[PDB]
């Protein structure tokens, strides 16, 4: 049994993540080739084609059937350590793995704070505007 939080490291788990994924066999961006590229299907009622790299958390929808998930990954998040990972999972060393899982938690925070920042700035703009209008 693999602890639930480490599942996304598992190709199989990643494929299994795909529900009603529109592209399919005959298409370049198959679920199988998506998982291999590191993506999970995090579909929203908005677009049930939302995919996210479990490792860098880069998010991508609007997929095209000839899109190569790996090519699309490299272009979008050139510096994603996952892309470097060339060994199978079970082929990985506990060290190697532990190093990767820290990397990921790190990317996770970098992602979240990036959100906080942008949210804050937006709040800052609304406040400034309102103070300005009051000057007038």
């Amino acid at each position: 049994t693999l602890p639930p939080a480490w599942q996304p490291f598992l190709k199989d788990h990643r494929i299994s993540t795909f529900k009603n994924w529109p592209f399919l066999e005959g298409c370049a961006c198959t679920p199988e080739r998506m998982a291999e590229a590191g993506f999970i299907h995090c579909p929203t009622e908005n677009e049930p084609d939302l995919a996210q790299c479990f490792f860098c958390f880069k998010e991508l929808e609007g997929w095209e059937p000839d899109d190569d998930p790996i090519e699309e990954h490299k272009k979008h998040s050139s510096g994603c350590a996952f892309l470097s990972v060339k060994k199978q999972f079970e082929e990985l060393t506990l060290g190697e793995f532990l190093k990767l899982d820290r990397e990921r938690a790190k990317n996770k925070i970098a992602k979240e704070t990036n959100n906080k920042k942008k949210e804050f700035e937006e709040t800052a703009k609304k406040v400034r505007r309102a103070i300005e209008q009051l000057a007038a």
Binding site: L50, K58, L60, G62, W63, D67, E72, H76
Partner: peptide, 5 residues
């Protein structure tokens, strides 16, 4: 493809 929103 494209980065979300």
């Amino acid at each position: 493809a494209r980065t979300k929103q």
